[PDB]
Design a protein around this ligand. Sequence first.
Ligand code: HEM
Length: 414
Amino acid sequence: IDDAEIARSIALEDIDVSKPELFERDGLHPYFERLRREDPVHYCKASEYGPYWSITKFSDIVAIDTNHKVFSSDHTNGSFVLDDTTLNAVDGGIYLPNFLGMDPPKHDVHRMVVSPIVAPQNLLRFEATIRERTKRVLSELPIGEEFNWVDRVSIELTTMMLATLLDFPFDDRRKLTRWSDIITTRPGYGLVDSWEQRESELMECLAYFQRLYAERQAMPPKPDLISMLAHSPEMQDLTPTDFLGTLALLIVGGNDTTRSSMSGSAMACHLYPQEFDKVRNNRALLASVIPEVVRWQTPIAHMRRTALEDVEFRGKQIRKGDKVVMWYLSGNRDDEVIDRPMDFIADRPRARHHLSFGFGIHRCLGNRLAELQLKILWEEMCERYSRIEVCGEPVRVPSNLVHGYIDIPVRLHA
Ligand code: HEM
C-alpha cells in the first residue's frame, strides 16, 4: 500500500486515521500532514468506533487536555481510549474503571494514594537501584550476534523496573508483560483467540494481585504501589471491578510506554548514528536526549475524551456526547511548534516541550521514573557500544494506542 498516494487522492471526508493497520506500517504522517494543513479539527463520520473528532495540532491538543470539565475522561462516559472494548463491558470487553478514567473530584482522591511513588527521596532510591540492575542485564548482551532488542533489552529492563515499583516476585516478572499485552488487545490480533481467553487471563491477574495485596496489608507500609493501595483508608471499599481496573492502569501504564521508549532508542541510534556519537562524546546531552526519545517515539499515539457540552472549537460545532481524540503522534510532528520534527535531534532546544505525557490534571504520574530508567540505559549504551545496527525487518504493534515494537533484530558493535 502507498499511503502517500491515498492521502493526496481521497476526499477529506473519507480520511480515517484510527485503523490499527496504519500504525503497524507507521503510515500516518501523510494523513496527519493533510489534516493539520487543511482541517485540523476534523469530523470522521465512518469508523469502527463510530464517528469522532481528530485534533491534530499541538496547541489545539493542549486546549482539549486541559479542559476536563468540557472534555470528559470518566468511565461513565466511555473512559479515555478510542476503542470502547479496551475498558468497557461491550462486544466481549469487561469494565475496567480507574483514576485515569475518572473526572474530578474522585480522580484526585485516587491519584494522591499512589503519588508517593514519585516523592523526591523515592526517585533517588529508585535511580540507585535501577542503575546496578541495568548494568547486570547489559553486560550479558553478546557483541556481533543478532538478537531481538525488544526481548533482550526493552522487555528485560521494563519488567525489572515495574517489578521494583510493585515489589513483584522477580522470578514471575514475565507475567507482567503478558498481562499488559492482553489488556490492550482484541481476538485475532495475535495474542488471544477470544474475548473469553482475555477475560480468563485477567481473572488470573486479579487472583495473583489479591494474594500480594493481602500480604502487603499485614506488613508495614513500604514504597511500593501495592503497599500504597493496601494501607490507604480511601481505597478500602474498592469493588472487585474497581480493584482490577486500577491494577490494569498501573500494569500497562508503566510497562507498554517504557518498553516502547526503549525500543525507539535502538531505532534512533541506527537511523541517526551521528546523534548517538554526539551524546557518547558529550554526556551533558543526556538532559536533552531523553525527552527527545519520548517525543520522537511517542509511545501513546492518542488519548480520547467525550464532550459533556455543546462547544464551538476552532469554528467547528462539537455536540454533547461526541468522541474527541487528541492525536499526540500528530501534535509531536507540528512544525509550527517543533522544527524538523520527523528527525531525532540529540541536542534540541526546549526538548521537554512535547505532548507524549499529556498536559493538565491527568499528566503522566510516572514520567520521572521512565526518564530515570531511560537515562541509565543511555549512560550504559554510551559506555559499551560504538554503534547499534538494526539488521533485519522491524515488526510493529497493531494498535492505534500503543505505538511500539514486537521485534527489532540488532547487532551490537564495540
Ligand atoms: C515514556 C513513558 C511513559 C509515557 C509516554 C506515558 C504516557 C502517559 C500519558 C499519555 C498519560 C495520560 C495523559 C493525559 O491524558 O493527559 C499517562 C498517565 C499516567 N501514567 Fe504514564 N507514561 C509513561 C510512563 C509511566 C510510568 C513508568 C508509570 C508508572 C510507573 C505511569 C503511570 C501513569 C499513571 C498512573 C497515569 C494516570 C495519571 C492520572 O490520571 O492522573 N506512566 N501516562
